[PDB]
Subunit: 101 residues, 2 copies
């Protein structure tokens, strides 16, 4: 539902930034393109998410020379994704063992 | 941190149940075994999670003939995992496009 979607939108946004600092319009457009035109992120939703991410020091913003407002993944954001990737990888292995397909 | 761990524990618990109705001790033991002895789930933590899952109609419990208390994934729980699997699969494809490794 809404929760799973926010969790998914979080993951996508962090991955876009991990690839390069980016601005809102650009992020939305590239996510739509990379999803075969299926995932059309809502701008207000991104702001909700960014507000939480910047409070938690995961992302920061700055002006890029009108000027565009760029968002960037912080050093903490980078570290957190590395942790997430390793821990979720372990979860996948557990599931693989349990399913025994 | 705590949040990501709860999200991960949720995913593992649902997958264990998807494979078969199971009781707390059994779940903890099998998860530890399937994780190479690394993930030792805390019993109180499972109860916190189960309480939320049964309120949301994702899991239910019943007596198995002392009797063990079995937990089972509901029809809704099953449907939700199918939805989750398909949507997260799409998220992975987006990430694959973005990373272009």
């Amino acid at each position: 539902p809404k929760e799973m979607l926010r969790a998914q939108t979080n993951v996508i946004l962090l991955n876009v930034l991990k690839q390069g600092d980016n601005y809102v319009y650009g992020i939305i457009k590239q996510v739509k393109e990379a999803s075969n035109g299926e995932m059309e992120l809502n701008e207000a939703t991104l702001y909700t998410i960014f507000k939480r991410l910047e409070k938690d020091g995961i992302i920061s913003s700055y002006w890029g020379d009108g000027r565009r407002k760029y968002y960037r993944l912080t050093e903490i954001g980078h570290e957190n994704m590395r942790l997430a990737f390793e821990s979720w990888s372990r979860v996948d292995k557990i599931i693989e063992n349990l399913e025994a397909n």
